[PDB]
């Protein structure tokens, strides 16, 4: 037996696997249980800590992926199938993974905890793009990633009920954070230097841990990639969550909350998944059925209220967006859009798209969007209309909620760093018009271009090494800049006055000012006044 | 006669005239100033449409400018050329319906295209006798026959009690039409071609030109039009019959006339002209800038419908139009009524002063509409920057009142069969006495079009003299042919017509013509498409 692969955690002994990374070995501990399987009567309930086990638990393989919808739109297509589950679907999925240097760090190492995205309805920590082996091997980081319940299983709520209180998927995340505090030192990780990092729904989850006091004691720094707790999609009211849970219950034949939830608990997991999408109030894109609820408990108030009133003084935050946040969402529900054609749409198709892209918009609000995003020089130009449609979706859902978050955090004492990721992977199978879609920065941050068998360019390998250094320097120090490296140029903190952010592309860092400032003034200041007063 | 200059004796329908041999830089010109075209609109004739001037006996002396129509005289900055150059230069009188004619000397042997000037002054001021409207250069240099008329302004020209016989409104526009009718009948006596008449005007003069395009009885009196920094459409050029009735009724009250329209108008007719002028400004519904009390009324007669309705539905097939704006349309109006603004300081305003200014500059805007303006014109990188706020304030006023109504007009005329040519005048006169922050204010292109830099005693630069000659050629080439371009001179950059597809316009500055696309397109989409919907809804 290898002593480097034998770890005793509070619940007992584990056995990891020595994994080969380009530059040398890594110790991986995959499929560690952090909770009692949330099955049977425990479905929809908060996670309970995993009871101790006898003997040496085998932690050499990834465990089950949480029960979720599987995309079947483009079968065989890498573009969709890379995000699809790579392990068996099961309700028994509350497991975490730990990658550490081989041998085990001599001194306590900063911990990076990954929270995946997938609109709160999908995802797994076992995906190839979330492989912590490069960050551990190259940057000496202790990387942790956990599975958390998604869809009805993680976010169906009957607010005020004891049986289905909502936000349990976030509680699974918090339980994995408590686990890190209690056991990461056994792996050589520093529980006193924990950075959460997530993308999309994962970034929204990270934001929701910033905004929930019982989570705040479990981490020190945060990275929010292409997602935020504020915004049109990350949360729902207690009323809206109650409406959707009641409708799904009706859809599956379930007719008192105790009674309704009990019936929902008798339903096979796939019956619940089969109706998940049928509870959205309007035809929409970038809207998910079961998401965090503003319960007055995990979230004491709405993320908008909490970001405006919170004290973020002793907090360091790295935030950012990709060049084309909304391009993916268009091929899913906007007529005229396809991955297989150049998607040159007509003016009518654009006006129709704005209603789907901004489903909460009134006739007047949708017109304000249309008149803002039209190029009044070429108002009928199909390329402009196609790109404007991508921008509406990306700006509304990601860029302007990010701009609002960075602004409020900066104004309220946080130390904020903002970026725009503009590099399209050479390997990308989505059409060129989609540009840099949501999530296609992750493989660079994780350092996948370092594996020579993955067919990335040399430029991309050097670029991945750069991003790995920004992220791990941020985790170590709260600053993504290299203290050893003089002349960079430096990455300035984002401030309300200077609104500085940098561009992450193949060229050296470029400092820019104002994150889509005029456009986000429209979304963040004007449009709310349009949907409020009228 | 007998010893008189034989070139200065001309007969018209009303009788004989004697003109004057004037000196222009390049040679002599014939001027016939102070020709009467209407019966003096005095006494019982006040507020009534003009009556054609009855014939006179003997030779009428037409060697001097006549009376300026009764109007408000600016006394804001005394001694200041900036304000006093627009002030009346002849006696104020209700007896003011006279016109001026400049022609080459000797008079042309063959019929010459006619240019008819309609001055601005918010429909409350102006005169055709002003130095910047001197037709001597255009007559001498370009061989033009230039006509300019005085038309009633203020209460005298535009007070209306709509539906009444005694004060029907738009009489100031009828004075203009009467002067157009006069040109048709008599211009051939001066060597002018009645079949080639181009109207040209600036600001309220341009709104007037547009209103002649939109009124059928005027359409037979001209062939081409130039609208400089003004349009019939827009927030200030017209008022509803209801609003004109409200203002006339209030003015009556303010001067002692108790509100039957006959009784009210009769009483208004007994009031000294200065009493009416003293209260003119007190009838505006809100604290505002770029809003005038007595302006054309949508009467269902001169204007069959609103200028917006008429520009959207009209057939402009056989029409050639030259339209344009100056670099800083709104800068003047800020020193007038926006707190924080002065001609004597750099006018760096605060955010609060900007929000306050938007309410004065867009007086019809609701709380939500004013916020849409504020959020559009703010630079969200430097939202507190006083220079940006100052310039944004000028832009709101200029865009709202001139640039976007012009963009709207050019678009609708172009879409409905007209040949449109658009420009942006960007040259600030070297002689200008307004501060540099005001840039190129409203009306400061006029002296270049009229060719004042050609007079060496006026202290303009050589560049400016060459530039004036260029503009005189664009304008007269347009009057002659419906195209501002010189056919002989090809390699010289050309001026493309403005179209809905390409939205092309040119820059008129010291540098050769530069073609630009989209006349403040994103911003004017806001004023012309969005803002009205913010009214139509909340
Ligand atoms: C209420 C109202 C209208 C405000 C805008 C008009 C400003 N204005 C006035 C004036 C000032 C206060 C209340 C009402 C009117 C004015 C009042 C008098 N007595 C004489 C001249 C002017 C005046 C002259 C020119 C100009 N552009 C605005 C003016
Ligand atoms: N929303 N939803 N996303 C599910 C679709 N799968 C994809 C995901 C991400 N990016 C994608 C980009 C293109 C296509 C599918 C994608 C980011 C991480 C979450 C999952
Ligand atoms: N409107 N009104 N303005 C009264 C002041 N007179 C001026 C005029 C014009 N420009 C001016 C520019 C600055 C100051 C007064 C001006 C355009 C021609 C009509 C009159």
Q: What is the 3-state secondary structure (H, E, C) of B376-444?
A: HHCCCCCCCCHHHHHHHHHHHHHHHHHHHHHHHHHHHHHHCCCEEEEEEECCCCCCCCCCHHHCCCCCC
Question: DSSP state, A293?
Answer: B
Backbone angles phi, psi at B48, to 5 degrees: -90, 155
Q: How far is CA B201 from CA A28, A277, B36, B111, B308, in A?
A: 83, 64, 21, 23, 20
Nearest-CA neighbor of A318 among A219, A415, A220, A217?
Answer: A415
> Domains of chain B, with CATH numbers?
1-538 (3.40.50.1820)
Q: Which residues lie closer than 8 Å to A180 by C-beta, 6 or more apart? A: A111, A113, A144, A189, A191, A194, A218
B120 to A60, B57, B197, B419: CA distances (angstroms): 87, 34, 19, 24
Please check whether residue A517 touches B, CB under 8 A: yes
CA–CA gap between residue A95 and residue A125 (Å, rounded): 9
Strand partners, A195: A112, A221
User: Is there an atom of ligand 2 within 6 Å of A289 CB?
Assistant: no
Query: What's the gap between Cα B258 and its chain centre?
Result: 34
Angle B201-B394-B297 (CA atoms, 0-180°, nearest 5)? 45
* Catalytic (active-site) positions of B: 203, 329, 442
Residue B293 near residue B247 (C-beta atoms within 8 A): yes
Cα A72-A78-A84 angle, rounded to 5 deg = 50
User: Roughly what angle, to the nearest 10 degrees, separates helices B241-254 and B261-268?
Assistant: 50
Cβ contact B392:B377 at 8 Å = yes
- Could you tell me which residues are beta bridge partners of residue A197? A114, A223
The answer to whether B372 contacts A499, with C-beta atoms less than 8 Å apart, is no
Question: What is the C-alpha separation between B132 and A80, in angstroms, rounded?
Answer: 71
Q: Which residues of A touch B392 (CB under 8 A)?
A: none
Give the C-alpha separation, A227 to A349, whole Å.
27
- Kindly state whether A72 is in contact with chain B, defined as any CB-CB distance less than 8 angstroms: no
**How many whole angstroms separate alpha carbon A6 and alpha carbon A187?**
10
Q: Which ligand is nearest to the CA of B291?
A: 1
Smallest CA-to-CA distance from B320 within B225, B217, B221 is with B225
With an 8 Å Cβ cutoff, are A526 and B375 in contact? yes
Neighbour tally for A161: CB within 10 Å: 17
Residues near ligand 3 with C-beta < 6 Å? B 74, 82-83, 86, 120-122, 125-126, 202-203, 332, 441-443
Distance (Å, rounded) from C-alpha A455 to C-alpha B501? Answer: 46
Between positions 366 and 395 of A, the ones with CB within 8 A of B are 367-368, 371, 374, 376-377
**Nearest-Cα residue of chain A relative to residue B537:** A364
Closest ligand (CA of A393): 2
Contacts of B496 (CB under 8 A, 6+ apart): B502, B504, B506, B515
Instruction: List b or e across B421-441, with b for residues whose CB sees 16 or more CB atoms inside 10 angstroms.
Output: bbbbbbbbbeeeebbebbbbb
B40: helix, strand or coil? coil
Ligand number nearest to the C-alpha of B336:
1
CA distance A405 to B230: 45
CB neighbours (10 Å) of residue B119? 26
Per DSSP, what are the bridge partners of residue B93? B69
How would you class A52 by CB atoms within 10 Å of its CB: exposed for 0-12, middle for 13-18, buried for 19 or more? exposed
- The dihedral through the CA atoms of B367, B369, B375, B377 has a sign that is negative
Task: Give the residue from B259, B245, B201, B194 showing the smallest Cα distance to B221.
Answer: B194
The gap between the terminal CA atoms of chain A, to the nearest Å, is 70
Peptide bond before B106: cis, by omega within 30 degrees of 0? yes
Task: Confirm if B158 and B123 have CB atoms less than 8 A apart.
Answer: yes
Q: Are A155 and A169 in contact (CB under 8 A)?
A: yes
| Residue to mutate (ligand 3; options B68, B71, B121, B284; most atoms within 8 A of CB) | B121
Contact B247, B268 (CB under 8 A): no
**Number of helices (H) and strands (E), helices first, in chain B?**
19, 16
Nominal resolution (angstroms)? 2.7
- Determine what percent of chain A falls in helix, strand and coil, rounding each to the nearest 5: 40, 20, 45
3-state secondary structure of B315: coil
Non-local (6+) Cβ contacts of B342 within 8 A are B335
Residue to mutate among A371, A379, A499, with most B CBs inside 10 A, is A371
Closest listed residue to residue B499, CA positions, set A371, A377, A380: A377
Determination method here?
A: X-ray
Q: Could you write out the three-class secondary structure of B264-303?
A: HHHHHCCCCHHHHHHHHHHHCCCCCCCCCCCCCECCCCCC
CA distance A507 to B140: 64
Cβ of B21 closer than 6 Å to ligand 1, yes or no, is: no
Structure tokens at A253: 């034949």
The residue whose C-alpha atom lies closest to atom 2 belonging to ligand 1 is B287
Breaks in chain A (C to N > 2.5 A) come right after 255
Give B182: exposed, middle or buried? Use CB within 10 Å, 0-12, 13-18, 19+: buried
Q: A231 Cβ partners below 8 Å, 6+ apart?
A: A204, A303, A397, A398, A401
Mapped onto helix, strand or coil, the DSSP state of residue A17 is strand
Cα(A131) to centroid(ligand 2), Å: 17
C-alpha distances in Å from residue A530, one per residue of A235, B356, B368: 21, 21, 8
Distances (CA, A) of B302 to B213, B214, B440: 11, 9, 34
Cα angle, residue B34 at apex, residues B32 and B40 outer, rounded to 5°: 150
Number of residue pairs across A and B with CB atoms under 8 Å?
Answer: 46
Decide if B359 contacts B396 (C-beta within 8 A): no
Residue among B372, B521, B533 minimizing CB distance to A526 = B372
Burial string for A455-483 (b: 16+ CB within 10 Å, else e) reads ebeeebbebbbbbbbbbbbbbbebbbbee
SS3 (DSSP) at A350: helix
Give the DSSP letter of residue A468: H
Could you tell me which of B38, B291, B58 has the C-alpha nearest to residue B178?
Answer: B38
* SS3 call for A235: coil
Ligand 1 site, residue B250, Cβ cutoff 6 A? no
Per-residue buried b or exposed e for B484-516, using 16+ beta carbons within 10 Å of the residue's own CB: bbeeeeeeeeebbbbeeeebbbbbbbeeebeee
Tell me how far apart the alpha carbons of residues B130 and B61 are, in angstroms, rounded to a whole number: 20
What is d(CA A152, CA A273) in angstroms, rounded to the nearest whole number?
Answer: 8
Q: Up-side HSE of residue A164: CA atoms within 13 Å toward CB?
A: 28
d(CA A499, CA B452): 50
| 3-state SS class at B101 | strand
Question: Cis omega (within 30 of 0) on the bond before A103?
Answer: yes
* Integer Rg of chain A from CA: 22
CB A461 within 8 A of CB A33: no
Question: Taking CB atoms and an 8 Å cutoff, what residues of chain A touch B367?
Answer: 533
Give A-chain residues touching B524 at CB under 8 angstroms: 376
Which letter, b or e, does each residue of A64-89 get, where b requires 16 or more Cβ atoms within 10 Å of its Cβ? bbbbbbebeeeeeeebbeebbbebeb
Which phi and psi angles does B201 have, rounded to 5°? -155, 165
Query: If you search the block for the tokens 């900055």, which residue do you land on?
Result: B77
Closest partner residue to A374 (CB to CB) among B380, B525, B538 is B525
Radius of gyration over every alpha carbon of chain B, rounded to an integer in angstroms = 23
- For the stretch B53-76, what's the b/e string if a residue is b when 16 or more beta carbons lie within 10 angstroms of its beta carbon? beeeeeebebbebbbbbbbbebee
Evaluate whether A218 touches A178 at the Cβ level (below 8 Å). Answer: yes
Is the distance from CB of B138 to CB of B451 less than 8 angstroms? yes
DSSP summary character for residue A317: E
Q: How far apart are CA A197 and CA A391, in angstroms?
A: 25
């Amino acid at each position: 037996e290898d002593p480097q692969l034998l770890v005793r955690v509070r619940g007992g002994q584990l056995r990891g696997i020595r994994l080969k990374a380009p530059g040398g070995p890594v110790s991986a501990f995959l499929g560690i249980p952090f909770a009692e399987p949330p099955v049977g009567s425990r479905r929809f309930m908060p996670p309970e800590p995993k009871r101790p086990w006898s003997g040496v638990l085998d932690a050499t393989t990834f465990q089950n992926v949480c029960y979720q919808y599987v995309d079947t739109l483009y079968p065989g297509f890498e573009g969709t199938e890379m995000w699809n589950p790579n392990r068996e679907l099961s309700e028994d999925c509350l497991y975490l993974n730990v990658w550490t240097p081989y041998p085990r760090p001599a001194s306590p190492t900063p911990v990076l905890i990954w929270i995946y995205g997938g609109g709160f309805y999908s995802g797994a920590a076992s995906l190839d793009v979330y492989d912590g082996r490069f960050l551990a091997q190259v940057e000496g980081a202790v990387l942790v990633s956990m599975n958390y319940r998604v869809g009805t299983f993680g976010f169906l709520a009957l607010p005020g009920s004891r049986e289905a209180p909502g936000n349990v998927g976030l509680l699974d995340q918090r339980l994995a954070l408590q686990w890190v505090q209690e056991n990461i030192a056994a792996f050589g990780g520093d529980p006193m230097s924990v950075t959460l990092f997530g993308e999309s729904a994962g970034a929204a989850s990270v934001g929701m841990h910033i905004l929930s006091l019982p989570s705040r004691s479990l981490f020190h720094r945060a990275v929010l990639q292409s997602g935020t707790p504020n915004g049109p999609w990350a949360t729902v009211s207690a009323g809206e969550a109650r409406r959707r849970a009641t409708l799904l219950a009706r859809l599956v034949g379930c007719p008192n909350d105790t009674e309704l939830i009990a019936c929902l608990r008798t339903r096979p997991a796939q019956d619940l998944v089969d109706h998940e999408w049928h509870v959205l109030p309007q035809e929409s894109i970038f809207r998910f059925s079961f998401v965090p609820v503003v319960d007055g408990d995990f979230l004491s108030d709405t993320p908008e209220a909490l970001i405006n009133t919170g004290d973020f003084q002793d907090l360091q935050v790295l935030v950012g967006v990709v060049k084309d946040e909304g391009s993916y969402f268009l091929v899913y529900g906007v007529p005229g859009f396809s991955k297989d054609n150049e998607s040159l749409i007509s003016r009518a198709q654009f006006l129709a798209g704005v209603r789907i892209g901004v489903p909460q918009a009134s006739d007047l609000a949708a017109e304000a969007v249309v008149l803002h995003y039209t190029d009044w020089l070429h108002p009928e130009d199909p390329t402009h209309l196609r790109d404007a449609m991508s921008a509406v979706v990306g700006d509304h859902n990601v860029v302007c909620p990010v701009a609002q978050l960075a602004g409020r955090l900066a104004a309220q004492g946080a130390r904020v760093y903002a970026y725009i990721f503009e590099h399209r992977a050479s390997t990308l199978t989505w059409p060129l018009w989609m540009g840099v879609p949501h999530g296609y920065e992750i493989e660079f941050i994780f350092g996948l271009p370092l594996d020579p068998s993955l067919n990335y360019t040399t430029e991309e390998r050097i670029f991945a090494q750069r991003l790995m250094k920004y992220w791990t320097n941020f985790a170590r120090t709260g600053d993504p800049n290299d203290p050893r490296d003089s002349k960079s140029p430096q990455w300035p903190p984002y401030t309300t006055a200077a609104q500085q952010y940098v561009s992450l592309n193949l060229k050296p860092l470029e400092v820019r000012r104002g994150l889509r400032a005029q456009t986000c003034a429209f979304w963040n200041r004007f449009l709310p006044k349009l949907l409020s007063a009228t």
